[PDB]
Amino acid sequence: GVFEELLRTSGIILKVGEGQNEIAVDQTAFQKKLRVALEKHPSYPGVVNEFISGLESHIKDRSQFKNCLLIKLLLGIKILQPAVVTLLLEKIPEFNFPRLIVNQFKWLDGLLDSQDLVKKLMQMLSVSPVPIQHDIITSLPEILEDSQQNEVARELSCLLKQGRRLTV
Amino acid sequence: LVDLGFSLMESYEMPAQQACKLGASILLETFKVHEPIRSDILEQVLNRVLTKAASPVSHFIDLLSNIVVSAPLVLQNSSSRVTETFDNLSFLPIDTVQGLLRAVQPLLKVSMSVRDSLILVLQKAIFSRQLDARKAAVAGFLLLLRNFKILGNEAFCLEILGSLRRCLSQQADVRLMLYEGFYDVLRRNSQLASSIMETLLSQIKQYYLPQQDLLPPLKLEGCIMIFLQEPLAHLLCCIQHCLAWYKSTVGFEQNFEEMLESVTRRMIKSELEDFELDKSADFSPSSGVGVKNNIYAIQVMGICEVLIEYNFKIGNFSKNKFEDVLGLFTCYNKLSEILKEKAGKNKSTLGNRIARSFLSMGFVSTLLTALFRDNAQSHEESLAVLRSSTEFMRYAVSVALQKVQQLEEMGQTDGPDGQNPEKMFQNLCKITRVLLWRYTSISISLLCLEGLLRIFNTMQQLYAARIPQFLQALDINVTEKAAF
């Protein structure tokens, strides 16, 4: 894969299973190498799409899914932020996997959308079961990036009015 | 004795101040005397120290700091409490958190477990979505940055650099304190200075809007929305102070000077028409457009003050820089006088005459010495043309009059070294001479009467032990010169 080829050329080698990625354990060297690889190999728009498809295929693989607990460096990229958000949204219903995902999203950095991921989380809580919805809603202080503070507050108050079974 | 002191401290809550002083003195004496009750006393006061969250505990932190500085290892023998002391530290910062951190600082620098626990609490503190108490967290972290030595593990700093920058996109009131506090830690490291300068360069470039011969570069509308979330005068003052320190210690610095030079050149090559505020009847109080223009007016004249300070350091007897300086002030008072603030029909004079200034006490001290008593052939008539600007004379001291009033009421003041009293005391010594001499030269002199009357009322009430130094600098015969 283009993502696999770029990772092998620079950054982290293709780790199998939960084993650690073959990259320097630091947010500086690993992220810089991943960014250099992403600027080199998937630089072309077609190569960019191929790398995105390869990264999605790796994420769908259970081995790299357990490895993610590289992927962290790729998600830190500005372009990879919407891709990481889409991958998380896809993996939400299909998989304490939701709890682990919520914890990872907790204390997260700036994503590519300031008023869309909150709506996605609200929709998931509306669809997701009791514990999953409660876990998603409890992450709102972390998810309340000030992008949609007041509006989400009013919507959540309305849901609470309609949410007597999950008011706590 | 310890029971007596415990009753005394609460009885203190003038007579209350005398009771508190007596209780603190007896506790310090019994700590320095009663050796075998030292651990029990420390545990009891730690239990009491975190005992009045709503009520003021300034005396508590004062006594705890005194006993800790007397016995640095007492709390080390009182272990399992360094981690415990952070139970609800981020609830009521009234300077209590700063005092607690300063008192316990030796323990942190000799206790790695305390540092790790506070690091763990830092993630919760900085990530608090609310803004009611997040100021205490960032203030404590800024103090800690100077708390740890900068000898040179450096990986500790390289990790902790980005923690506060992750919260840069915060409320304007919250964003305020880092600008004031970054200069203190910048004098403790070299690589950290480069990183902080780079981050501030990114922040200022977020609003610079580079161009040539066009609209005012400052995108004032960025912080318009009703409230504001990006103060600019404090940021620019921090920029100039950090630049000065970086230059003194020894391209971002080339970018800094070019950006500073360009914006100063852009400001003089502009007017109110260039800015969004063109007509006098443009903005009004309690108006959506009005308050927006009101905030813009508050920002822009605050910016003008900062550029005045920077060019003075650059323009060492340089008429061209003075010409830019004098022309810059013409924009400053153009907003004022007629449309000052907005208008302000209350016959009141906030901040002596103008809003809170933005000038370092060293600079205003040096500006007056250049402005008054700065007679010499070395000057290139830049002072003379500066002396020609009568309103510049009035504004020259009026800022310091606000500055001393800030030190008159509060024990600290804005600007670098403001909270350092010994550094401030020297500044207090230098300033008074030109103020008194200008009055004796023979309105403007009426300002100096206020300036003197407030400077005495400060040191007699703040620098009680430092009076002999001032009397020596006034030029133990205290009464002789005072009567003179």
XYZ file of C-alpha atoms in Angstrom, chain B residues 150-461:
312
model
C 17.377 25.967 33.443
C 20.844 24.466 33.853
C 22.252 23.058 30.625
C 16.891 16.981 32.177
C 16.143 19.300 29.251
C 13.624 16.737 27.995
C 11.402 17.938 30.853
C 11.306 21.442 29.380
C 11.018 20.230 25.782
C 7.936 18.323 26.897
C 6.392 21.130 28.963
C 6.852 23.888 26.338
C 3.748 22.939 24.370
C 1.454 22.351 27.330
C 0.489 26.006 27.761
C 0.565 26.657 24.008
C -2.098 23.960 23.678
C -4.342 26.336 25.671
C -3.365 29.494 23.770
C -6.731 29.435 21.985
C -8.542 30.424 25.186
C -10.532 33.338 26.605
C -9.076 36.832 26.309
C -8.969 37.293 30.087
C -7.272 33.898 30.362
C -4.993 34.683 27.407
C -3.974 37.878 29.226
C -1.835 36.419 32.002
C 0.584 34.388 29.866
C 1.635 37.531 27.994
C 2.488 39.268 31.272
C 4.187 36.201 32.750
C 6.253 34.884 29.841
C 9.029 37.458 30.274
C 9.894 36.229 33.779
C 10.647 32.684 32.588
C 12.402 33.893 29.431
C 15.417 35.014 31.486
C 16.020 31.426 32.672
C 16.763 29.526 29.443
C 18.092 29.889 25.897
C 16.353 27.198 23.820
C 13.104 27.848 25.691
C 13.497 31.497 24.689
C 13.741 30.493 21.024
C 10.657 28.277 21.299
C 8.598 30.934 23.094
C 9.672 33.523 20.527
C 8.648 31.189 17.693
C 5.240 30.541 19.269
C 4.664 34.263 19.802
C 5.766 34.909 16.212
C 3.134 32.447 15.013
C 0.531 34.113 17.234
C 1.329 37.625 15.981
C 1.465 36.440 12.358
C -2.041 35.093 12.968
C -3.109 38.771 13.028
C -0.364 40.652 11.153
C -1.795 40.528 7.614
C 1.388 41.572 5.761
C 1.115 44.042 2.876
C 2.660 47.268 1.587
C 0.961 50.671 1.283
C -2.537 49.481 2.157
C -5.035 49.218 5.049
C -3.840 49.056 8.686
C -2.258 45.610 9.114
C -3.878 44.930 12.496
C -7.014 42.873 11.824
C -8.887 44.509 14.687
C -12.112 42.724 13.707
C -10.598 39.394 14.780
C -11.205 40.102 18.473
C -14.469 42.016 17.952
C -16.588 38.949 18.741
C -19.739 40.875 21.578
C -16.841 40.192 23.939
C -13.181 39.863 22.940
C -10.881 36.842 22.903
C -7.487 38.211 21.806
C -5.953 41.193 23.640
C -3.328 42.923 21.511
C -1.618 45.621 23.594
C -0.431 43.122 26.210
C 0.721 40.754 23.464
C 2.720 43.506 21.755
C 4.278 44.617 25.049
C 5.307 41.022 25.740
C 6.703 40.862 22.197
C 8.889 43.927 22.676
C 10.093 42.874 26.140
C 10.999 39.374 24.940
C 12.749 40.832 21.891
C 14.771 43.183 24.096
C 15.800 40.374 26.444
C 16.687 38.079 23.534
C 18.852 40.764 21.927
C 20.551 41.532 25.250
C 21.283 37.861 25.966
C 23.024 37.331 22.615
C 15.152 34.362 11.137
C 12.461 34.898 13.755
C 14.278 37.895 15.248
C 14.726 39.330 11.752
C 11.022 38.677 11.184
C 10.258 40.361 14.514
C 12.145 43.579 13.768
C 10.823 43.718 10.200
C 7.256 43.176 11.414
C 7.726 45.759 14.172
C 9.337 48.213 11.751
C 6.684 47.639 9.080
C 3.716 48.041 11.431
C 5.236 51.215 12.885
C 5.812 52.473 9.343
C 2.301 51.326 8.423
C 0.790 53.157 11.405
C 2.338 56.519 10.518
C 1.472 55.873 6.866
C -2.191 55.626 7.904
C -4.931 57.582 9.666
C -8.342 57.153 11.277
C -9.807 56.976 7.766
C -7.541 54.002 7.046
C -8.820 52.346 10.220
C -12.451 51.305 10.590
C -13.056 54.350 12.824
C -13.239 57.303 10.419
C -15.992 59.665 11.596
C -16.498 60.965 15.120
C -20.173 59.922 15.027
C -19.411 56.282 14.259
C -19.652 54.259 17.490
C -21.823 54.721 20.584
C -22.117 52.922 23.934
C -24.608 50.055 24.210
C -24.527 49.681 20.410
C -23.477 46.556 18.541
C -21.486 48.594 16.043
C -20.651 51.014 18.849
C -19.101 48.532 21.272
C -17.216 46.912 18.385
C -15.680 50.277 17.496
C -15.243 50.926 21.222
C -13.169 47.748 21.551
C -11.243 48.663 18.394
C -10.498 52.122 19.794
C -9.361 50.561 23.077
C -7.040 48.199 21.207
C -5.451 50.579 18.708
C -4.321 53.318 21.093
C -3.034 50.553 23.347
C -0.981 49.348 20.382
C 0.398 52.856 19.830
C 1.874 52.871 23.339
C 3.831 49.657 22.729
C 5.380 50.874 19.476
C 6.388 54.074 21.286
C 8.402 52.041 23.795
C 10.114 49.844 21.193
C 11.271 52.648 18.892
C 12.791 54.529 21.833
C 15.156 51.632 22.545
C 15.969 51.272 18.841
C 16.297 55.008 18.247
C 19.333 55.889 20.357
C 19.406 59.645 19.674
C 17.925 58.940 16.229
C 15.798 61.812 14.932
C 14.043 59.620 12.355
C 12.873 57.207 15.055
C 11.850 60.180 17.201
C 9.956 61.601 14.219
C 8.130 58.276 13.992
C 7.638 58.370 17.773
C 6.231 61.906 17.770
C 4.045 61.196 14.748
C 2.803 58.001 16.381
C 1.595 59.933 19.431
C -0.359 62.276 17.141
C -2.468 59.241 16.251
C -2.766 58.281 19.925
C -4.300 61.550 21.134
C -6.286 61.915 17.900
C -8.472 59.104 19.205
C -8.330 60.745 22.639
C -9.430 64.268 23.641
C -12.417 64.374 21.273
C -13.409 60.698 21.050
C -11.435 59.591 24.124
C -12.426 56.007 24.892
C -15.847 56.803 23.470
C -16.679 60.152 25.114
C -17.241 59.317 28.770
C -19.607 61.959 30.121
C -18.887 61.309 33.792
C -16.340 64.063 34.651
C -14.139 61.253 35.979
C -10.487 60.608 35.140
C -9.933 56.857 34.955
C -6.274 55.941 35.356
C -5.042 59.417 36.321
C -6.183 60.690 32.916
C -6.102 57.763 30.422
C -6.821 54.037 30.510
C -4.256 51.552 31.820
C -0.936 52.288 30.145
C 1.398 49.731 28.566
C 4.858 51.143 29.308
C 7.602 49.433 31.291
C 8.551 51.398 34.394
C 12.184 51.478 33.295
C 11.268 53.092 29.979
C 9.005 55.814 31.390
C 11.686 56.489 34.002
C 14.250 56.859 31.216
C 11.895 58.768 28.906
C 11.392 61.567 31.435
C 15.132 61.751 32.131
C 15.586 62.215 28.391
C 12.534 64.495 28.300
C 13.578 66.496 31.386
C 17.250 66.944 32.434
C 18.326 65.208 29.191
C 20.288 68.211 27.930
C 23.496 67.481 26.016
C 25.081 67.939 22.602
C 24.825 64.177 22.011
C 21.090 64.528 21.384
C 20.150 65.453 17.809
C 17.289 67.861 18.703
C 14.924 64.864 18.861
C 14.233 65.736 22.494
C 13.621 69.365 21.502
C 10.970 68.476 18.926
C 9.625 65.999 21.479
C 9.595 68.910 23.932
C 7.698 70.878 21.272
C 4.797 68.409 21.544
C 3.043 69.914 24.563
C 0.500 67.086 24.701
C 3.434 64.670 24.640
C 4.672 66.381 27.815
C 1.277 65.914 29.464
C 1.070 62.271 28.387
C 4.733 61.667 29.259
C 4.149 61.811 33.017
C 0.428 60.974 33.048
C 1.204 57.314 32.348
C 3.611 57.138 35.297
C 1.006 58.812 37.510
C -1.320 55.911 36.732
C 1.592 53.515 37.261
C 2.390 54.807 40.752
C -1.324 54.764 41.615
C -1.331 51.089 40.636
C 1.522 50.597 43.102
C -0.268 52.943 45.515
C -3.340 50.734 45.921
C -2.128 47.296 44.815
C 1.247 46.012 45.946
C 2.271 45.165 42.370
C 2.009 46.785 38.947
C 2.035 45.906 35.268
C 5.191 45.803 33.183
C 8.428 43.860 33.599
C 9.890 43.799 37.114
C 6.681 45.409 38.368
C 6.209 42.965 41.243
C 9.909 43.095 42.149
C 10.099 45.737 44.902
C 13.881 46.198 45.022
C 13.935 46.659 41.246
C 10.935 48.971 41.589
C 12.556 50.840 44.480
C 15.488 51.895 42.302
C 12.989 53.051 39.677
C 11.164 54.938 42.432
C 14.435 56.643 43.381
C 15.247 57.809 39.846
C 11.794 59.043 38.824
C 11.185 61.459 41.706
C 14.088 63.780 40.851
C 12.817 64.939 37.454
C 9.268 65.304 38.790
C 10.422 67.624 41.577
C 12.931 69.519 39.427
C 10.380 70.117 36.663
C 8.072 71.751 39.208
C 10.935 73.925 40.470
C 11.686 75.004 36.886
C 8.719 77.398 36.902
C -1.164 72.870 33.609
C 1.836 70.541 33.432
C 3.458 71.199 36.815
C 0.148 70.372 38.510
C 0.702 66.788 37.349
C 4.052 66.604 39.150
C 2.384 67.714 42.383
C 0.203 64.605 42.212
C 3.199 62.478 41.248
C 5.211 63.505 44.298
C 2.271 63.363 46.717
C 1.646 59.760 45.680
C 5.290 58.656 45.699
C 5.756 59.588 49.368
C 2.464 57.954 50.365
C 3.678 54.748 48.709
C 7.139 54.224 50.219
C 6.039 55.356 53.685
C 3.361 52.643 53.453
